[PDB]
Amino acid sequence: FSDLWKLLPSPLPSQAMDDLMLSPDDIEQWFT
Amino acid sequence: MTELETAMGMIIDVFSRYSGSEGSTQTLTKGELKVLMEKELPGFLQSGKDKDAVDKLLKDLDANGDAQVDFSEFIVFVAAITSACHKYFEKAGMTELETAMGMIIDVFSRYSGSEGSTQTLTKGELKVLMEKELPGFLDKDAVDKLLKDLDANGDAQVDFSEFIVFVAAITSACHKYFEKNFDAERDALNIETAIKTKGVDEVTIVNILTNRSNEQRQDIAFAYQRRTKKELASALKSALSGHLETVILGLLKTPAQYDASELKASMKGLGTDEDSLIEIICSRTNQELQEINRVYKEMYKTDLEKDIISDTSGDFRKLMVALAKGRRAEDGSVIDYELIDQDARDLYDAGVKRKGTDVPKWISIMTERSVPHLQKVFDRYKSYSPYDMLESIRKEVKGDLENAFLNLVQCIQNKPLYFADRLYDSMKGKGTRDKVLIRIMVSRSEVDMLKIRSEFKRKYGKSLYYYIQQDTKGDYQKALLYLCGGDD
Ligand SMILES: [Ca+2]
Ligand SMILES: [Ca+2]
Ligand SMILES: [Ca+2]
Ligand SMILES: [Ca+2]
Ligand SMILES: [Ca+2]
Ligand SMILES: [Ca+2]
Ligand SMILES: [Ca+2]
Ligand SMILES: [Ca+2]
Ligand SMILES: [Ca+2]
Numbered sequence: 001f002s003d004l005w006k007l008l009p010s011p012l013p014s015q016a017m018d019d020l021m022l023s024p025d026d027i028e029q030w031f032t
Numbered sequence: 033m034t035e036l037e038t039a040m041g042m043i044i045d046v047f048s049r050y051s052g053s054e055g056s057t058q059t060l061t062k063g064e065l066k067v068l069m070e071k072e073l074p075g076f077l078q079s080g081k082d083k084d085a086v087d088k089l090l091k092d093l094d095a096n097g098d099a100q101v102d103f104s105e106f107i108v109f110v111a112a113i114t115s116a117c118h119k120y121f122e123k124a125g126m127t128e129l130e131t132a133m134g135m136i137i138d139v140f141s142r143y144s145g146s147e148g149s150t151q152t153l154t155k156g157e158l159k160v161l162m163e164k165e166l167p168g169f170l171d172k173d174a175v176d177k178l179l180k181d182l183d184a185n186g187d188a189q190v191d192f193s194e195f196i197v198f199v200a201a202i203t204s205a206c207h208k209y210f211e212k213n214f215d216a217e218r219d220a221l222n223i224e225t226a227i228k229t230k231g232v233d234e235v236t237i238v239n240i241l242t243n244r245s246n247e248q249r250q251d252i253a254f255a256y257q258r259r260t261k262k263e264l265a266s267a268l269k270s271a272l273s274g275h276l277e278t279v280i281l282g283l284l285k286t287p288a289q290y291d292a293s294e295l296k297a298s299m300k301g302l303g304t305d306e307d308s309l310i311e312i313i314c315s316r317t318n319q320e321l322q323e324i325n326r327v328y329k330e331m332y333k334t335d336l337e338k339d340i341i342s343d344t345s346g347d348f349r350k351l352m353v354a355l356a357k358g359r360r361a362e363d364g365s366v367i368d369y370e371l372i373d374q375d376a377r378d379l380y381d382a383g384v385k386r387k388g389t390d391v392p393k394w395i396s397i398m399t400e401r402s403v404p405h406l407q408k409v410f411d412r413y414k415s416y417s418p419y420d421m422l423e424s425i426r427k428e429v430k431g432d433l434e435n436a437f438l439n440l441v442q443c444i445q446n447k448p449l450y451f452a453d454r455l456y457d458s459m460k461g462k463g464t465r466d467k468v469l470i471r472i473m474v475s476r477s478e479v480d481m482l483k484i485r486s487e488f489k490r491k492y493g494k495s496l497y498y499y500i501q502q503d504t505k506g507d508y509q510k511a512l513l514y515l516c517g518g519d520d
Binding site: 001002003004005006007010011012013014015016017022023024027028029030032 | 114
């Protein structure tokens with residue numbers, strides 16, 4: 001990835017991640 | 033590779049493994065998503081609670097609404113799960129994908145420091161993390177700009193949510209930069225199955241045929257004929273209808289066969305479809321045009337040139353005939369400055385400088401000279417003329433001749449942008465100019481679709497994918513979307 005970082009030139013998907021609303025309750029249910 | 037690099041590569045490899053099993057290598061189908069969930073995140077999807085679980089999950093992750101999960105959607109999903117797991121491990125005090133997520137968590141926590149009850153990175157911690165886990169990514173204080181970019185809540189630290197958003201973004205950038213086993217017998221068997229299924233399984237037909245090269249579609253057609261003893265194109269013509277049929281039948285022809293049939297269609301019957309004739313004749317290269325000439329006479333028992341002559345007249349005919357010969361000078365890659373200047377001055381003298389137009393001069397210059405030469409000629413022409421070549425054409429000539437010259441200069445200057453403009457025109461208004469949209473998507477999917485998409489997004493502000501989504505529906509839409517190849 002070292003040399004790829006110069007090749008690329010990429011926004012932050014913070015709102016899309018927040019919208020999923022995944023919380024520790026979900027992980028607790030998943031881990032049974 | 034660093035631990036973080038390894039985790040990012042593992043997430044990319046997981047996506048790649050499951051996205052390649054059907055349809056596009058760029059997205060997950062619903063079935064692919066269910067398989068991925070069962071093998072990489074077992075128990076997360078609580079199937080057995082409800083067998084519709086994957087449909088709900090797909091709807092939750094499908095941000096652009098194409099019923100598939102591309103890598104952006106997948107990676108935001110993975111980041112949300114990882115952040116939730118970090119918070120769950122905090123509050124409470126293995127597959128490949130789970131391993132990668134755990135690795136990202138461990139890497140964050142090995143450089144993080146206590147703050148309140150959370151773990152965060154100050155600027156120095158972020159600096160060392162970047163230099164040891166993402167070498168080469170990082171101005172004298174580029175780490176401060178990275179901090180400000182990631183510090184969403186503005187508390188001068190990077191908590192795990194901000195970090196994982198950053199990791200998702202750079203993994204997505206890597207995958208998209210990477211964007212920018214085949215077996216014909218198996219494809220033919222699955223297509224025969226989809227054809228003979230009651231009601232026809234168009235989804236499988238699209239998934240396969242719009243995600244193979246033209247050569248691979250030829251292989252599939254040969255294997256289909258050998259398996260079934262009937263022609264694949266006839267079976268599909270019977271099995272399909274409407275615009276989807278148009279698309280699939282076009283894809284089944286070789287590039288030269290498709291172009292030849294479209295030209296014949298542009299001249300067969302009363303009048304002429306000059307727009308289509310111009311598009312094909314001005315946009316195609318020497319090799320493409322020579323193959324078209326051969327295949328056209330094979331298919332229709334007459335020369336393409338004779339059909340053009342019979343269907344057109346005047347200077348428009350002269351230009352079309354000359355271009356269709358497909359014997360433009362090849363890129364010599366040795367710059368003839370004297371000839372650049374002389375051609376520019378001749379183009380000026382023939383048009384804007386005088387009353388009327390020396391059209392044969394324009395035709396000679398613009399059909400005979402190589403494309404790089406003519407790019408330089410147009411730039412030099414500007415030095416003589418107050419109007420560039422396109423505006424000069426608009427001022428000098430009219431009708432089909434003007435349309436032909438405009439299209440030709442556009443293809444000489446920036447052919448991907450030419451096709452982007454044509455696609456936008458085919459979709460912008462009411463309904464769709466489906467003939468143009470289909471022809472361009474079929475003929476350019478394997479040629480310069482990435483550059484067409486780049487120019488389209490640059491000029492119109494949303495992706496070609498998006499406009500196709502808005503103008504078309506159903507299996508037809510999905511076929512065009514696969515031919516586009518990806519969003520943005
Ligand atoms: Ca796929
Ligand atoms: Ca999607
Ligand atoms: Ca922060
Ligand atoms: Ca059907
Ligand atoms: Ca039909
Ligand atoms: Ca005609
Ligand atoms: Ca006409
Ligand atoms: Ca003039
Ligand atoms: Ca429209």
